């Protein structure tokens, strides 16, 4: 049936579906899992790496990348698209700071990255397929710590705790069970690591996971090797 | 050999342009019909006129247009395409007069529209407009001019032409008539045209359901003959025959 | 056979053959008879002008037209395409005349018309010009006769024929053609090669003949062509 | 039995199954003892890989168009039962026939014989063989110089 | 079916239309080329000399891209003209910018980048042309390359493209002196390969075109051998082969005597 | 029926023609690369040539800057185009900021160019995988790898070509500090890596080494022969 | 069909253009939105769905210039794009003329903008059903627009998944409109959303979203606890 | 004056089947003489030379542009350009840029390839072709050179009798010109010879 | 299907453009619209269908004002109707700005006809699937009415009808001495026409749109004032009863 309705982003199906958009959403699944948490003390991000074998340095599988001094970004999906949208995010944050001399709120930043992900095939901009990447922007704006999830179809929303990636449906349940509002960042780190361990194949061991935290204080902190060992 | 049919720029393996031929088929689809004949000092065009409703206004319904003061045209084909082509011809005539500073010979006006149609048949845009346009005018040196501008790129000059559904029978009758003393008078040419149309139609013409236009070496203006002239010619000439 | 690769013009075939240009050449061959002869001191072009009736004023659309007073052009194929190529050939000749103050050499005019055909045979929405041109010219002192094909290919000819029965025309010319054929006899040879292809009576008005010699290309008038036809018959 | 093209809609599934059964019988579970199989094909390119495998068709001989003096051998073989004059040079006939298959050689001899039959004569002469070569090896060539010059 | 568009990759990673053009080049004429310590030369097979055609163009397949380089073309005629014009334009653009006749390698790389763009961009079929470039450049002296439709170019001591080019190159391999061949020996070998590759076993000036590039007086010279020299070479070679045949017959007579 | 379009997703979520460009890269001759302490080396299979066919015109290693070298594997035309654009980018970043071009920076540039050609529907992806090896101005023997899909990574040693899988397994097995402990053990490692897939040895190996702040040099046939002889001596001694 | 529903450039051989009908269907996949008016007000109440009890709820009332609110049911992408275009039109009118743009004219501009991408093969129809509120000098409006590029001046309308319930409730209870009270009008909107609900579920301070415009009240949105005075007072 | 910026001088005359084109050698910017080996007569064929004069940058650029055009023309139309066609080509080259021109005055001298008859022409800085059977002078000291032209010429002139005449004329003209001189190159084109001389001059 | 009907740039192998014909078929499915030319004006009526009661009286308005003095009455797809109305508005504005006097209706019809012809010619854009009529009155030119259909034909009409019931509307319009009636009576007769063509059982609800432009208003096209509309509707109910008799 979907032989003439799902081969183009601009041909509606009888249901009213953008099947290329759902296919990009599926391509999100393939990626390595990420788990972002937002609590009263900041925002945490814990992601799984999929190191195939040594001789591939740690600093090429970029799941966490720093967005301004007050946001971190966890990627799930195609790397080229991830680079493009992270670059859009950085240039937007810095342009907003340049023009308004203030730190872009995470709502604004994820809104604008979504605004880029919107223009699939509009003849006023230049892509032709949805940016097949689902991103988590976890930052600290004037409303306290916040965490905003973006899906490839340009939809972004606040999330007090969200997991993305291959381990999406298998970790949303755990997050649902464990999360509670009055949570401290230490609890957030431990809980995210526990859920990652639950839904990974290799044994979590400080060189198959990345961790970062953006706090109402010290900037985005990427946990270093010794800190990884301590937490683990 | 029907697979080479869905684009105006793909040849058939036997070197035929099917969607150029289908433009002629559209001409025939026009439903109406037209004829034209040129005499020693006159040129006369006759054409159908269907008014299949009492509310249609005969003042507006007409297929004899005035491209410029001296050049007139009869259309045979879809009315919208015909009127677009008429507007184009008016534009080109005006531009010619503006640039080169003298009235466009019918030769060139028919050539120009033929070349527009040729551009459309070669570059795969537009959709070759389905009308056949027959131009009449007065040329100072050669004399009267009757030309036809088919929607594939021929702008050929005719002693007597026919367009539309009855084109074949009209051409046969006109050959038969021309083979006898081609030097025709004004009234004799008006006749030849009207008689050709009447016989190819197996009908007798009312003074209204036929549109006739004429140009002459003494009247170089596109005179659309009125009901009075049509009635007079029909009745008197058929009687005196 | 190679069936799929025949509806486009930007896609080769396993044989390496672009089917669409060959189809265009078939359209060309399915056209009017036209003949060309390179005399020792001139060139002669002729082409059947038969109409479908006596109605057509057989003086309104010619088929042997000039491009300069040393170069001329006749065709076999379609007619609108021919008018476009003649217009562009005149434009190229005049552009060359402005850039270099010298009448365009026939070889270069042929090359540029071939380049135009190439432009039109190389995009996904342009129909290759279905018409093959014989270009006659007098440059330096040596008459030139070239053929330009829809494929963008230009090539010299001692004498040729093109149209419905090019095979018969060319065998006849092969029999009757010798290098030192002065123009007055080349005209007879061309008219005879048109006779062996021309159904019905070759009246002086349904044949077009153009001769290109030192004096300059000239399309023979009805009186001259009638004289020649009577002499030949 | 030829290339196994896809089936279900427009594939020669039935002839393909015939080929598959032939494959299995030539080689397969409970194979053969002393049954030899010779196959012939005018062009193998499309012949299926399973058959041309060196398990079912072990050897693949080629029959190149008779070369020089092989054409002479064929001329002799198909001109022995004939009436040749003192001064017929079958070698010269061979050179005049380049790249001509053995069918062409037979046809050349036969057409020389028919030419002899024409003129109430029971003798074939060198010129008769030449005319036979001309009439047999008719190499039709396209006259469309444009289609021929497409390629430089 | 992975061959309906130039820019389409096949599941086994082959640009089909590119291979299609590469094999199509076979149907073109026959060009071969030989490098020799003294010079460089190309040979070309005039497929078509029907006696009603003419010889207006001294060269129908070999062109002079500039004073120091020549190129032989094989493939579609229209693409051939387009590519030769672009080659001339590149050469003179290089002269304008730098004021030194373009190194042959640079000229070939430029044209082959053009062909690469064509095979990689949008709706444009790959140029159905293969070219053999000969030339002299101050960096590496005499030089000979072959450029295919795919934009790939190889520097060949000797090579051949076109009909029976595989046989031509096999015989080149057999009879090429890898570092000692002179221009006359190169001409002899070219005639031999042409005789063995052309469909007709008999050669003549009506079917061959030979081009020779040599440095003399410090300046390059690109000469298209006239029919007189062509026929003299064809002769010399045919009579040499006839003498070889006479020697073979003498050997047969000796064997019979034994 | 979800192929043939460079900007079309398969219902499972794959872009197939970029993957096809990758599989086209798989059809190239082995190229290995290693970064030592102060020597970064790239080795390649020549795959030999007919004696008439020159070899200067068959290149697989190209220096994009005094401190960045590139080893190609894939299609030759795409190789040339990408290398040419890489060179212009190198000497354009030199003007953009008066600093030698970081190896990571030129790797990003190649990734950007490849993605630019992939993401649109009238651009055939560059089917080439490249190993970039260099010394950053600050001083570090960096090595990255770039795929046709416009993705780049920071490898310490890896190979692309016909035998990428086997040679990567071998390097996993036989790469250590001892290996990268001198200016010659790294070279020896790379020759050992090549010999697994390339057999003729003398006529099927080419090496190019870059020492810290030292211009890249392509080791001579004699020098590579001497090294293979030395590893052969060690092989027989330990056998 | 099966060969006439691949683009908006092809008519079917029975007088219907299929892509526009497909987009009309697309509008139904959003959430219930019930919009309505009185003699001085215009209220838009929309059902904000939840993607998880962690992730917050999708907003469905956006705030165009101070005299236009907008409730969107359809593609979020197209909703955002048309929201940006409406904001641009309002600001441009404010710049050239110093008068808030009439909401019977902003709608015309949107209709033209959405018809243009239903007659060219260069884009897809838009995919948001739009309820535009606002109080120009005349009176409060509730305009509806659907991807078909037809705009309706509705006494009170609704759109989205389970929008019939709302439309029937409007049929039944609209006789009261044009004389209700500042809060009673909102109550009627809430009842419409209640009927759109799937039962079991109710109007909770979260899933309820309310937007208000009118004389002496520029556009406002009541979310989180700003809505409690409505749900608490709502009849059980 | 723009011409006076870099001076220079070019001359050409024709005798009996022989032609001569003579140029001063100097490149001084303003008054600072920079070199004395600047090429101003360029070979565009076997027996066809162009003596571009005037501003230095424009002279060089017109030379490169015209060589570009002539190379293309010859290869594409295999032939040796006739002098009239070269004159028209230069006219087009200069007149393509009337609204801001190359500040040079080309002067073409040569022999017709076929009939071996002589040709000399000049052009203005916008491209009015200028052909005359006696003289062509361009560049600064135009008045002095015209005076020598008129007052030192006789018809039906042979190789050496034309050598002496063109030399003397340009020698005097350029000696009587500031911002010009310091060496005179004379190119004599004959039916089968071409001579490039570097005659004396008041290099001071 | 047919294989020659996709896109409007392809002649079917008879000389027919199935896309234009489908556009006309979509035209012949919308509510009826009548127009009649009098001696001193032209009157329009449209059989507006309230698809729901929620819609204010004053929903989709199928009688548009093009220029001060031309009325456009549209039947078909109303989005395309509004687009065509904007095209005609812009063309009237351009004519006034470029020439100085109010647009002649014959010219406006010709230009809009050529516009729709452009959109039937091309393969990247579908032909307008909505027919309409242009009517006006001027002291100089006089009352005029015109029809423009998808194919783009501007035949002049004394009276016309477009939509579901056009044959019935015609047949009933011939039952009128249009040549001599006046706007006041023709308004009531238009009401009668609409109410005789209307099908209550099929269209459920219904409302009436009317307008006239004539000398009686000085050429300023105006929606029929409320009182005249009410009186015409009363007479239409009475005429329906009389026909039922």
Author numbering:
A (entry chain K): 4 to 128, 132 to 238
B (entry chain G): 6 to 246
C (entry chain H): 2 to 234
D (entry chain C): 255 to 406
E (entry chain I): 4 to 261
F (entry chain J): 2 to 240
G (entry chain L): 3 to 238
H (entry chain P): 2 to 205
Study authors write:
Proteasomes are the primary protein degradation machinery in eukaryotes and comprise a 20S core particle harboring proteases capped by one or two 19S regulatory particles (RPs). TXNL1 is an abundant (>1 µM), 32-kDa protein with an N-terminal thioredoxin domain and a C-terminal proteasome-interacting thioredoxin (PITH) domain. In this study, we report the cryo-EM structure of the human proteasome bound to thioredoxin-like protein 1 (TXNL1), a conserved thioreductase that interacts stably with proteasomes and, in Schizosaccharomyces pombe, shows genetic interactions with proteasome regulators.
We determined the structure of the TXNL1-bound proteasome to an overall resolution of 3.0–3.3 Å from cryo-EM datasets of affinity-purified midnolin–proteasome complexes. Although the thioredoxin domain of TXNL1 is not resolved in our map, we could model the entire PITH domain (residues 118–289) bound to PSMD1, a structural component of the 19S RP, the ubiquitin receptor PSMD4 and the deubiquitinase PSMD14. Electrostatic interactions facilitate TXNL1 binding to PSMD1 and PSMD4. Residues involved in these interactions include R234 of TXNL1, which interacts with an acidic patch on PSMD1, and E136 and D162 of TXNL1, which interact with a basic interface on PSMD4. The C-terminal unstructured tail of TXNL1 engages a hydrophobic groove on PSMD14 and extends into the PSMD14 active site, where H289, the C-terminal residue of TXNL1, coordinates zinc along with H113 and H115 of PSMD14. TXNL1 binding to proteasomes was also impaired by preincubating proteasomes with 1,10-phenanthroline, a zinc chelator that inhibits PSMD14 deubiquitylation activity, but not 1,7-phenanthroline, an inactive isomer. This finding is consistent with our observation that H289 of TXNL1 coordinates the catalytic zinc of PSMD14 and is important for proteasome engagement. Wild-type (WT) TXNL1 associated with proteasomes, but the interaction was severely impaired by mutations to disrupt the interface with PSMD1 (R234D; lane 10), PSMD4 (E136R and D162R; lanes 3–6) or PSMD14 (lanes 11–14).
